[PDB]
């Protein structure tokens, strides 16, 4: 089994809804975004092209992050996913230097520290981050998703790395990744690339698949099809 994703760039509108859905699903600290994007502007006015490419972990066939990890915290599972036992991460950051794609983040900052602020913009009138935490019963942020804790820390400790887990906790329940469900145009499709009848396997036969940095030799399993823009008429 080799789970992967096909992203249709013609359907994609570059809105970031996938990346915001990932925030709500995975309780990433402010500034940490497992789902992100690469946007480019090309050409000189008036012949200007703008493209947006959504990015995530490519759950690579030959993942260098796994090979360099000294503790074994970073590992492949039986679905082909690259997952992490965060409990065994010593924060050595070797995975981040080995990953060609820059999709791993390091928790140098204490996650959700801004929610410990108890100051009020209008004293005894407006509330505060700390007060909202107390009112709602949340541990770190009122937006924290307890589902995440099924397979991974809901709130990661400082001095560990983290990245896209392909929403493994949702897959375990037979559900879709948050970013797949969040996409208005259904531009994102996942499935088993080892199954020739899967939708993802058929999409990359029906359309010419593209990968990010295939020259790095990792065998990424996020594939991009079609084009964000179209050739200019007239």
């Amino acid at each position: 089994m080799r789970l992967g994703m096909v992203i249709d760039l013609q359907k994609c509108v570059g809105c970031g809804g996938c990346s915001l859905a990932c925030k709500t699903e995975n309780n990433t600290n402010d500034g940490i975004h497992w789902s992100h994007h690469i946007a480019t502007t090309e050409g000189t006015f008036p012949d200007v092209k703008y493209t947006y490419i959504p990015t995530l972990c490519n759950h690579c066939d030959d993942a260098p992050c796994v090979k360099v990890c000294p503790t074994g915290a970073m590992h492949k599972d039986k679905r082909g996913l690259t997952l992490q036992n965060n409990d065994e991460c010593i924060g050595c950051k070797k995975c981040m230097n080995a990953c060609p794609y820059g999709v791993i983040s390091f928790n140098a900052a204490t996650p959700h520290r801004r929610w410990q602020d108890d100051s009020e913009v209008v004293a005894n009138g407006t509330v505060s981050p700390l007060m909202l935490l107390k009112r709602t019963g949340a541990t770190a942020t009122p937006n924290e998703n307890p589902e995440r804790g099924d397979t991974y820390p809901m709130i990661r400790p400082k001095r560990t790395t983290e990245k896209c887990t392909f929403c493994d906790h949702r897959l375990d329940k037979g559900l879709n990744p948050a970013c797949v469900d969040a996409c208005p145009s259904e531009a994102r499709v996942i499935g088993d690339l080892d199954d020739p009848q899967s939708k993802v396997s058929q999409l990359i036969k029906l359309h010419k698949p593209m990968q990010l940095k295939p020259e790095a030799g990792t065998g990424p399993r996020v594939f991009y099809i079609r084009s964000f823009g179209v050739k200019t008429a007239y």
């Binding site: 809105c15 946007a39 602020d117 209008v122 505060s128 909202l132 019963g137 208005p184």
Partner: protein, 814 residues
């Protein structure tokens, strides 16, 4: 950190509750996911017939609004009696009973003094239960001054649809079946009125539709279009008129809708008049008169001289639309039409929807489907005392209906609101002073052009109360703050949406336990205020509520605040769930089924439904708008002047018959072009939930999803040509100055900007709202406030405020 055993896993077991998002007037039906009493996720309601599970990205920011750490948790009163940008209100907490007592005493004092018209109710956003607070309460007190925000929104965009085909309202666009899409400034995968559905369909539609986007900046939609036309701000109608001209010369109007020459031969020759009797129109009126009076001379060469557009492109577009007809749709945005002469851009662009037959056609555009939702509570005439009957006849504070403010909504002189001009009436006490103001869900100091006029006006109002979740810029000037339960998570409401050939009606309902000591703006607060007024001897509102707003099943009035909140929605939606709505769409078996599904869908739109029965003077689609002539004649007769004198007083160029046909108005411009060499191109952020996501950290984290913009910054985008001219580099701190004000932000050089313009998102520049939205709350803004640059100007025929085209600015490094 072991994985949890299956019986203890939590993924997917929470509860989904239906509500409605109001991040824009798409008003998408949603479900909220709730676990441990907290809202954790938002998704499109799968039962929605308009958009289904599809959503724009802003649905997720909702979660940082309800859980905004700067929300008010209590009513408050100011203790500094002075008001102003420089005056700290020194708010202190008080009870609801005390807050409503203060407001009630002030209202009753007006009535005792026979000046109930000096009360004003201001409405920003709203739901369809607004009639009680907005209209009935206001009129029962005795005031005509229920002032919506419609004219700072999009009233100029309704002028074309109303005066050409009788629709004072919006259209839905049949993108799934379109063969040609022409957008004058609309960016429907980022803003406009079904971002979820048009995002769902846009990319797929490129395989069967040719798409042209006309916008001074390279918008997300233009970046996914076959042609980006980087129009000079304010010149859109030039292109629309030349396309129509070519359509006639080439003979490619849509004959099944428009008609044809009696003898078959096309007699439209450039520059030359045609006999009206030689053409037989079918469902339109005035084609030959339009041609003879103006369109015969709106050639591609004329248009190219003004715009720089290649005439061959104009001709090719016109021919492509002719071949696509009637599967042709023309969009207008605020950018094209919210200009001082913009009524005629709405008319000129929308005329193409008639000329190519797209109106009410497959692949074209048409109004929202009929639904049985009620929009008003019962008449209150029997509850009007003599004080109220006299007061409601006074001139409105926004001066609508004066010679220079015709505001011809639905054909009536003084028919339309003039939101931004209410500040001018207030600060000049003309027609009279406003002494008591209640306002909700609005922030006009920030959202209206030249909002410092609202600073000035509100500082002169004896007593104002603001119904709001956050202390925003408008709140700074309030005597009393009345904290609102959040519309999306803590409220009972009802909204509608159109698209995908359907109209839907959706519920808003509480999905969490109320966080703080707040009340629902449109139901609980007017209920509580009516009770307080009755305690103080003025019981007409209370009697109206208790006798007219009663449960549709039991006939009983509400027993308490919470019951009333739900009753307001039950009352208006009863035609959907108590009665059989099968004739219009879904059959719902009960109130409970409506709440569980969360949405009611109409049947699909019947194409050509309105052909031959438009609500115009002629009942035709009017290229020569007898409808607008009748409205202008009424306004002219009211003021004992000619129509030409109306046009002159309202600063339009049209004289004679040109006032009634699509024609070119040179765009109004303000300021010396030598001192102010750049034209502002105001735009929305695709992460703006109107003016309400600037206190959401995730907004800033992803701000560069706006093409050309920069995460965690407020940037103004300049073409590199102008960057070189003015010595600007990426990241430079800059000041942008217009004749009326200034702002500071950072510079970004981007080739997607038309040279001679500067494209900057509205939405930052808050100095209040919260700690993330401002630098120093109450003192120093984060980013720059666009509306401080925009001179207070009006499309006087509609009442609309101008936000585009007339704004000249200069830039320098700070």
């Amino acid at each position: 950190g072991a994985e949890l055993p299956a019986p203890l896993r939590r993924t997917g077991v929470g509860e989904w509750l239906a509500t409605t998002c109001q991040g824009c007037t798409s008003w998408c039906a949603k479900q909220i996911y709730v676990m441990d009493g907290r809202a954790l996720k938002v998704r499109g309601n799968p039962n929605s017939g308009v958009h289904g599970m599809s959503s724009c990205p802003r649905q997720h920011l909702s979660l940082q609004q309800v859980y905004d750490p700067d929300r008010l948790r209590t009513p408050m009163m100011r203790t500094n009696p002075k008001k102003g940008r420089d005056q700290d209100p020194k708010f202190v907490p008080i009870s609801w009973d005390k807050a409503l007592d203060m407001l009630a005493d002030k209202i009753i004092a007006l009535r005792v003094a026979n000046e109930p018209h000096k009360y004003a109710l201001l409405r920003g956003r709203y739901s369809h239960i607004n009639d009680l607070l907005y209209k009935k309460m206001t009129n029962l007190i005795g005031s005509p001054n229920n002032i919506s925000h419609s004219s700072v929104c999009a009233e100029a965009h309704k002028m074309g649809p109303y005066y050409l085909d009788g629709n004072w309202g919006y259209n839905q666009y049949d993108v799934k079946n379109a063969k040609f899409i022409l957008s004058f400034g609309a960016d429907p995968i980022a803003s406009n009125r079904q971002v979820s559905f048009y995002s769902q369909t846009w990319g797929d539609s490129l395989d069967h539709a040719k798409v042209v986007v006309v916008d001074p900046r390279l918008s997300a939609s233009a970046a996914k279009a076959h042609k980006w036309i980087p129009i000079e701000p304010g010149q859109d109608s030039v292109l629309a008129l030349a396309i129509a001209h070519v359509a006639l010369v080439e003979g490619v109007w849509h004959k099944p809708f428009v008609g044809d020459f009696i003898e078959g031969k096309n007699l439209f020759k450039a520059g030359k008049t045609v006999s009206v009797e030689s053409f037989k129109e079918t469902h339109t009126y005035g084609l030959v008169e339009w041609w003879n009076q103006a369109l015969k001379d709106y050639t591609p060469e004329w248009a190219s001289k003004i715009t720089g557009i290649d005439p061959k492109t104009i001709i090719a577009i016109a021919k492509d639309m002719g071949a696509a007809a009637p599967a042709v749709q023309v969009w207008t945005s605020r950018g094209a039409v919210m200009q001082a002469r913009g009524t005629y851009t709405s008319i000129s662009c929308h005329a193409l929807n008639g000329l190519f037959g797209g109106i009410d056609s497959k692949g074209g555009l048409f109004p929202g489907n009929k639904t049985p939702l009620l929009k008003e509570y019962p008449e209150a005439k029997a509850y009007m005392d003599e004080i109220a009957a006299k007061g409601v006849k006074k001139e409105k504070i926004d001066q609508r209906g004066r010679l220079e403010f015709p505001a011809l909504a639905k054909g009536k002189s003084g028919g339309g609101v003039i939101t931004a001009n209410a500040a001018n009436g207030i600060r000049n006490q003309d027609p009279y002073e406003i002494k008591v103001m209640l306002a909700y869900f609005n922030n006009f100091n920030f959202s209206n052009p030249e909002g410092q006029r609202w600073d000035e006006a509100l500082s002169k109002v004896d007593f104002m109360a603001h119904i709001t979740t956050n202390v925003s810029e408008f709140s700074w000037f309030a005597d009393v703050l009345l904290p609102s339960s959040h519309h999306m998570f803590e409220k009972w409401g009802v909204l509608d949406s159109i698209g995908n050939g359907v109209a839907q009606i959706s519920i808003q309902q509480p999905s969490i336990k109320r966080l703080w000591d707040t009340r629902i703006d449109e139901s609980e607060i007017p209920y509580m205020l009516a009770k307080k007024l009755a305690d103080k001897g003025f019981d007409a509102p209370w009697r109206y509520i208790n006798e007219q707003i009663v449960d549709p099943e039991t006939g009983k009035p509400a027993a308490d605040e919470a019951e009333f909140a739900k009753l307001m929605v039950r009352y208006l939606t009863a035609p959907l769930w108590k009665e059989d709505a099968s004739k219009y769409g879904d059959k719902l078996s009960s109130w409970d089924e409506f709440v569980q599904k969360g949405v009611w869908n109409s049947s699909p739109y019947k194409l050509e439904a309105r052909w031959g029965k438009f609500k115009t003077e002629t009942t035709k689609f009017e290229f020569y708008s007898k409808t607008l002539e009748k409205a202008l004649q009424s306004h002219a007769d009211k003021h004992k002047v000619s129509i030409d004198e109306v046009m002159k007083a309202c600063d339009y160029q049209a004289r004679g018959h040109l006032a009634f046909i699509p024609h070119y108005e040179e765009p109004y411009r303000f300021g010396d072009e030598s001192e102010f060499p750049l034209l502002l191109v105001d735009q929305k952020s695709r992460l703006n939930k109107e003016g309400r996501t600037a206190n959401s950290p995730w907004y800033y984290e992803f701000k560069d999803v706006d093409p050309g913009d920069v995460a965690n910054e407020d940037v103004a985008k300049f073409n590199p040509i102008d960057g070189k001219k003015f010595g600007l580099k990426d990241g430079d701190e800059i000041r942008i100055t217009s004749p009326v004000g200034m702002l500071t932000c950072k510079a970004k050089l981007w080739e997607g900007v038309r040279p001679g313009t500067v494209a900057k998102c509205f939405g930052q520049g808050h100095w209040a709202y919260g700690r993330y939205a401002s630098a120093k709350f109450g003192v120093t803004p984060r980013g720059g406030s666009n509306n401080d640059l925009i001179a207070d100007r009006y499309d006087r025929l509609s009442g609309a405020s101008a936000f585009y085209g007339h704004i000249r600015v200069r830039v320098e490094k700070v």
